[PDB]
């Protein structure tokens, strides 16, 4: 259940944290980029596999802010990852996934792939672990990237910073990207960004 990062991964992380201190908001582009890629794979999978889109019927990317908990979630209904995939793809080696540590003290990755049960991968960057999601299969199919934001990144909880950023990066993504926001006597609901 517990693992150490490959030596190259530790170097990547430090290198990222050091050569990108200026453009931290880049993390959201990378994550939105990975969602889009996971959505292409299931889509390609659904060409020769009529069952492939069973666990979930939609192909989207939904982002929600949670202040009280200090969290930021990025969920896609792409191919998702198996337990073995979470361990190889996120523990061994275009900034990438680890750009998530530019704004987070902790990174959690919940993922459900058609060929396995929903798991959770977690890391504070000094090590990581994969466990079976005791909450069962709640995603259907896909991945949720949850970031435990650092103190200085708290401005990424404000729905306006997220929206401005999401629109820029949701420009070339051929999939609907929503942001759970509010309206005015104030109800919360998804808001398409692209
Ligand atoms: N949202 C996601 N859904 C499925 N797989 C993902 C997701 N995010 C990351 N991955 C996996 O992690 C791997 C490494 O991600 P990343 O660092 O962005 O490099 P890249 O996307 O260039 O391969 C991806 O190739 C993919 O296998
Ligand atoms: Mg990428």
Q: Which two tokens stand for residue 182?
A: 């509010």
59 close to 42: Cβ distance less than 8 angstroms: yes
Contacts of 123-128 with C-beta under 8 Å, sequence gap 24+, read 123/5, 123/90, 125/5, 125/13, 125/101, 127/2, 127/3, 127/4, 127/5, 128/2, 128/3, 128/5, 128/90, 128/91
- DSSP label at 5? P
Q: Which two tokens stand for residue 79?
A: 């191919």
121 close to 90: Cβ distance less than 8 angstroms: yes
184 close to 171: Cβ distance less than 8 angstroms: no
**Resolution, expressed in angstroms to one decimal:** 2.4
**Distance (Å) of CA 112 to CA 10, 38, 185, 191:** 26, 12, 36, 25
- DSSP label at 75? E
Q: Is the CB of 34 under 6 A from ligand 1?
A: yes
| Orientation of helix 159-169 relative to helix 26-48, angle to 10° | 50
Distance CA 131, CA 74 (A): 20
- Compute the distance from residue 36 Cα to the ligand 1 centre, in Å: 10
Q: Are strands 177-182 and 61-66 parallel, antiparallel or unpaired?
A: parallel
User: Three-state DSSP class for 148?
Assistant: strand
Q: Are strands 177-182 and 188-192 parallel, antiparallel or unpaired?
A: antiparallel
Buried b (16+ CB within 10 A) or exposed e, 157-173: bebebbbebbeebbeeb
Q: Is the CB of 78 under 6 A from ligand 1?
A: yes
Buried b (16+ CB within 10 A) or exposed e, 68-94: eebbbbbbbbbbbbbbebbbeebbeee
**Distance (Å) of CA 151 to CA 28, 37, 76, 155, 157:** 17, 30, 26, 9, 11
- Compute the distance from residue 184 Cα to the ligand 1 centre, in Å: 37
Ligand nearest to the CA of 92: 1
Domains, in order of start, for the chain: 1-194 (3.30.565.10)
Q: Which two tokens stand for residue 140?
A: 């259907």
Ligand nearest to the CA of 100: 1
Nearest to 110 by CA among 81, 67, 71, 69: 81
- DSSP label at 50? S
Beta bridge pairs of residue 145: 74, 109
């Amino acid at each position: 259940e517990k693992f150490a990062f490959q030596a190259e991964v530790n170097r990547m992380m430090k290198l990222i944290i050091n050569s990108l201190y200026k453009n931290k908001e880049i993390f959201l582009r990378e994550l939105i980029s990975n969602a889009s890629d996971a959505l292409d794979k299931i889509r390609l999978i659904s060409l020769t596999d009529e069952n492939a889109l069973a666990g979930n019927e939609e192909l989207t990317v939904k982002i929600k802010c949670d202040k009280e908990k200090n969290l930021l979630h990025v969920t896609d209904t792409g191919v998702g990852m198996t337990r073995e995939e979470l361990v190889k793809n996120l523990g061994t080696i275009g900034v990438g996934f680890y750009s998530a540590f530019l704004v987070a003290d902790k990174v959690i990755v919940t993922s459900k792939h058609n060929n396995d049960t929903q798991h959770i991968w977690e890391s504070d960057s000094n090590e990581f672990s994969v466990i079976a999601d005791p909450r069962g299969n709640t995603l259907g199919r896909g991945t949720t990237i949850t970031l435990v934001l650092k103190e200085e990144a708290s401005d990424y909880l404000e729905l306006d910073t997220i929206k401005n950023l999401v629109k820029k990066y949701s420009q070339f993504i051929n999939f609907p990207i929503y942001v759970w926001s509010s309206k005015t006597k104030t109800v919360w609901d998804w808001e398409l960004m692209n």
